[PDB]
Design an enzyme around this catalytic site. Structure first.
Site, PDB file in Angstrom:
ATOM      1  N   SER A  65       0.818  -1.212   0.000  1.00  0.00           N
ATOM      2  CA  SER A  65       0.000   0.000   0.000  1.00  0.00           C
ATOM      3  C   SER A  65       0.853   1.265   0.000  1.00  0.00           C
ATOM      4  CB  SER A  65      -0.959   0.004   1.196  1.00  0.00           C
ATOM      5  OG  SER A  65      -0.275  -0.288   2.403  1.00  0.00           O
ATOM      6  N   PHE A  66       2.011   1.202   0.654  1.00  0.00           N
ATOM      7  CA  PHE A  66       2.885   2.369   0.776  1.00  0.00           C
ATOM      8  C   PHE A  66       4.164   2.284  -0.055  1.00  0.00           C
ATOM      9  CE2 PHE A  66       0.162   4.284   3.814  1.00  0.00           C
ATOM     10  CZ  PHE A  66      -0.310   3.267   4.639  1.00  0.00           C
ATOM     11  N   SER A  67       4.474   1.095  -0.567  1.00  0.00           N
ATOM     12  CA  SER A  67       5.683   0.920  -1.367  1.00  0.00           C
ATOM     13  C   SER A  67       5.567  -0.123  -2.481  1.00  0.00           C
ATOM     14  CB  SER A  67       6.871   0.588  -0.465  1.00  0.00           C
ATOM     15  OG  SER A  67       6.840  -0.770  -0.067  1.00  0.00           O
ATOM     16  N   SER A 122      19.829  -4.542  -0.808  1.00  0.00           N
ATOM     17  CA  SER A 122      20.448  -5.751  -1.344  1.00  0.00           C
ATOM     18  C   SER A 122      19.393  -6.658  -1.962  1.00  0.00           C
ATOM     19  CB  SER A 122      21.264  -6.498  -0.279  1.00  0.00           C
ATOM     20  OG  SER A 122      20.610  -6.528   0.974  1.00  0.00           O
ATOM     21  N   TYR A 123      19.750  -7.265  -3.087  1.00  0.00           N
ATOM     22  CA  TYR A 123      18.863  -8.167  -3.805  1.00  0.00           C
ATOM     23  C   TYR A 123      19.098  -9.606  -3.347  1.00  0.00           C
ATOM     24  CZ  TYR A 123      16.925 -10.803  -7.808  1.00  0.00           C
ATOM     25  OH  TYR A 123      16.234 -11.690  -8.597  1.00  0.00           O
ATOM     26  N   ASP A 173       7.415  -7.743  12.913  1.00  0.00           N
ATOM     27  CA  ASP A 173       6.674  -8.429  11.856  1.00  0.00           C
ATOM     28  C   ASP A 173       7.505  -9.555  11.226  1.00  0.00           C
ATOM     29  OD1 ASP A 173       4.441  -8.982  10.337  1.00  0.00           O
ATOM     30  OD2 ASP A 173       4.720  -7.312   8.939  1.00  0.00           O
ATOM     31  N   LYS A 220       8.404 -13.091   9.930  1.00  0.00           N
ATOM     32  CA  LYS A 220       7.648 -14.144   9.253  1.00  0.00           C
ATOM     33  C   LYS A 220       8.457 -14.646   8.060  1.00  0.00           C
ATOM     34  CE  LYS A 220       4.908 -10.508   6.975  1.00  0.00           C
ATOM     35  NZ  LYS A 220       3.548 -10.060   6.561  1.00  0.00           N
ATOM     36  N   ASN A 226       9.206 -12.462   5.118  1.00  0.00           N
ATOM     37  CA  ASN A 226      10.161 -11.386   5.396  1.00  0.00           C
ATOM     38  C   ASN A 226      11.605 -11.866   5.545  1.00  0.00           C
ATOM     39  OD1 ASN A 226       8.275  -9.362   5.189  1.00  0.00           O
ATOM     40  ND2 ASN A 226       8.036  -9.065   7.401  1.00  0.00           N
ATOM     41  N   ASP A 247      12.143  -5.886   5.371  1.00  0.00           N
ATOM     42  CA  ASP A 247      10.922  -5.218   5.841  1.00  0.00           C
ATOM     43  C   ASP A 247      11.029  -4.655   7.259  1.00  0.00           C
ATOM     44  OD1 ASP A 247       8.410  -4.089   5.856  1.00  0.00           O
ATOM     45  OD2 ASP A 247       7.313  -5.983   5.908  1.00  0.00           O
ATOM     46  N   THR A 302       1.554  -9.347  11.662  1.00  0.00           N
ATOM     47  CA  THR A 302       0.772 -10.309  10.886  1.00  0.00           C
ATOM     48  C   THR A 302       0.103 -11.284  11.854  1.00  0.00           C
ATOM     49  OG1 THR A 302       2.295 -10.112   8.994  1.00  0.00           O
ATOM     50  CG2 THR A 302       0.828 -12.019   9.001  1.00  0.00           C
TER      51      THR A 302
HETATM   52  C1  LIG Z   1      13.698 -12.838  -5.977  1.00  0.00           C
HETATM   53  O1  LIG Z   1      12.590 -12.406  -5.189  1.00  0.00           O
HETATM   54  C2  LIG Z   1      12.742 -11.380  -4.282  1.00  0.00           C
HETATM   55  C3  LIG Z   1      13.962 -10.762  -3.967  1.00  0.00           C
HETATM   56  C4  LIG Z   1      14.058  -9.727  -3.039  1.00  0.00           C
HETATM   57  N1  LIG Z   1      15.273  -9.211  -2.812  1.00  0.00           N
HETATM   58  C5  LIG Z   1      15.390  -8.207  -1.921  1.00  0.00           C
HETATM   59  C6  LIG Z   1      14.334  -7.641  -1.197  1.00  0.00           C
HETATM   60  C7  LIG Z   1      14.487  -6.591  -0.258  1.00  0.00           C
HETATM   61  N2  LIG Z   1      15.733  -6.027   0.013  1.00  0.00           N
HETATM   62  N3  LIG Z   1      13.429  -6.084   0.421  1.00  0.00           N
HETATM   63  C8  LIG Z   1      12.186  -6.584   0.217  1.00  0.00           C
HETATM   64  C9  LIG Z   1      11.096  -5.963   0.998  1.00  0.00           C
HETATM   65  C10 LIG Z   1      11.154  -4.671   1.540  1.00  0.00           C
HETATM   66  N4  LIG Z   1      10.153  -4.083   2.258  1.00  0.00           N
HETATM   67  C11 LIG Z   1       9.019  -4.807   2.448  1.00  0.00           C
HETATM   68  C12 LIG Z   1       8.838  -6.097   1.963  1.00  0.00           C
HETATM   69  O2  LIG Z   1       7.753  -6.924   2.090  1.00  0.00           O
HETATM   70  C13 LIG Z   1       6.653  -6.569   2.936  1.00  0.00           C
HETATM   71  C14 LIG Z   1       5.415  -7.388   2.528  1.00  0.00           C
HETATM   72  N5  LIG Z   1       5.804  -8.832   2.553  1.00  0.00           N
HETATM   73  C15 LIG Z   1       4.804  -7.089   1.135  1.00  0.00           C
HETATM   74  C16 LIG Z   1       5.447  -5.955   0.370  1.00  0.00           C
HETATM   75  C17 LIG Z   1       6.433  -6.220  -0.601  1.00  0.00           C
HETATM   76  C18 LIG Z   1       7.040  -5.170  -1.295  1.00  0.00           C
HETATM   77  C19 LIG Z   1       6.665  -3.849  -1.036  1.00  0.00           C
HETATM   78  C20 LIG Z   1       5.687  -3.573  -0.076  1.00  0.00           C
HETATM   79  C21 LIG Z   1       5.076  -4.619   0.626  1.00  0.00           C
HETATM   80  C22 LIG Z   1       9.894  -6.655   1.235  1.00  0.00           C
HETATM   81  C23 LIG Z   1      11.974  -7.623  -0.692  1.00  0.00           C
HETATM   82  C24 LIG Z   1      13.047  -8.185  -1.429  1.00  0.00           C
HETATM   83  C25 LIG Z   1      12.896  -9.260  -2.380  1.00  0.00           C
HETATM   84  C26 LIG Z   1      11.662  -9.891  -2.707  1.00  0.00           C
HETATM   85  C27 LIG Z   1      11.570 -10.938  -3.638  1.00  0.00           C
HETATM   86  O3  LIG Z   1      10.400 -11.578  -3.988  1.00  0.00           O
HETATM   87  C28 LIG Z   1       9.254 -11.494  -3.140  1.00  0.00           C
END
Ligand SMILES: COc1cc2ncc3c(N)nc(-c4cncc(OC[C@H](N)Cc5ccccc5)c4)cc3c2cc1OC
Length: 276
Positions: A18-20, A86-87, A131, A133, A136, A149, A162
């Site tokens: 919702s915010f990102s 970071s990815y 949060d 889980k 995350n 997250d 959650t």
């Molecule tokens: C190959 O797949 C993936 C690789 C990835 N690599 C790095 C990441 C990183 N540094 N931060 C986040 C991240 C950062 N704020 C929030 C968050 O989630 C919160 C909730 N669940 C849902 C959500 C997801 C994204 C944006 C808002 C909310 C996730 C996600 C990833 C990430 C996610 C991937 O697939 C889901």
């Protein structure tokens, strides 16, 4: 030195909120891949999330550990904030739980140990995730954990996470502590072994009912020592959970018989067991 959107070739959306929105991007000058978190400034202001986003960036800036996401850079244009993270190539831990059904003992122990080590670092800085889980907890190319997250994190000198991982004290006193993450840890360990989280019901109210009553059961196959650990983390009194300050911290938690064979000092150097 500040980077621009023009410095990147954006790719697929990794996640939406919702915010990102988190989008995969390759930096043109370096060929490096980042997960860029993009947040619309108007929507943040409208929904009063400035303290949340500010704290998120501040918490991530203080993180310097292999088991946590790293903030490499930030920038903004007129409409949006960009956080360069970071990815994690292999995505969410949740994906792997659903794929293989449930982890064996070797895999449960290793990944639990990584989460415990991560939390020890995190709580040592006086930060609560709030949060925690499987979705995350990400996995890098090397299959080590990367916790992300931090948009609802708390810095110790109001939210509710959650449903399935919410601690009883949050439902009773509206208060959050380090022991709340440890409750979440207990749910996660259970989920790794059983395949599903311990408290499950048709709706949130019914889940919250089960949490405060400690209404959950172990399957018969459940690893005996893993069960003992879960029983010592899923404790209604947040003061009596293994790992918490009142229980003398991470020493006793790490010394639990389930972690007998674990070498705690160099987990991210070790090669992870294959998930089968
Ligand atoms: C190959 O797949 C993936 C690789 C990835 N690599 C790095 C990441 C990183 N540094 N931060 C986040 C991240 C950062 N704020 C929030 C968050 O989630 C919160 C909730 N669940 C849902 C959500 C997801 C994204 C944006 C808002 C909310 C996730 C996600 C990833 C990430 C996610 C991937 O697939 C889901």
């Amino acid at each position: 030195r500040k980077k621009r959107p023009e410095d990147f070739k954006f790719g697929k959306i990794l996640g939406e909120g919702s915010f990102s929105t988190v989008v995969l991007a390759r930096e043109l000058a370096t060929s490096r891949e980042y997960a860029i978190k993009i947040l619309e400034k108007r929507h943040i202001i409208k929904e009063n999330k400035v303290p949340y986003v500010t704290r998120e960036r501040d918490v991530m800036s203080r993180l310097d550990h292999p088991f946590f996401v790293k903030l490499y850079f930030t920038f903004q244009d007129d409409e949006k904030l960009y956080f360069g993270l970071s990815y994690a190539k292999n995505g969410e831990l949740l994906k792997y739980i659903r794929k293989i059904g449930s982890f064996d003992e070797t895999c449960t122990r290793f990944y639990t140990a990584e989460i415990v080590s991560a939390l020890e670092y995190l709580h040592g800085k006086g930060i609560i995730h709030r949060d925690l889980k499987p979705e995350n907890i990400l996995l890098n190319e090397d299959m080590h954990i990367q916790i992300t997250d931090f948009g609802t994190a708390k810095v110790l000198s109001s939210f509710v996470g959650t449903a399935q991982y919410v601690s009883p004290e949050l439902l009773t006193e509206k208060s959050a502590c380090k022991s709340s993450d440890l409750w979440a840890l207990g749910c996660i360990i259970y989920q790794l072994v059983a395949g599903l989280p311990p408290f499950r019901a048709g709706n949130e109210y019914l889940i919250f009912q089960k949490i405060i009553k400690l209404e959950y059961d172990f399957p018969e196959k459940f690893f005996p020592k893993a069960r003992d650990l879960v029983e010592k983390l899923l404790v209604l009194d947040a003061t009596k959970r293994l790992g918490c300050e009142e229980m003398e911290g991470y020493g006793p938690l790490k010394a639990h018989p389930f972690f007998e064979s674990v070498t705690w000092e160099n987990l991210h150097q070790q090669t992870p067991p294959k998930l089968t």
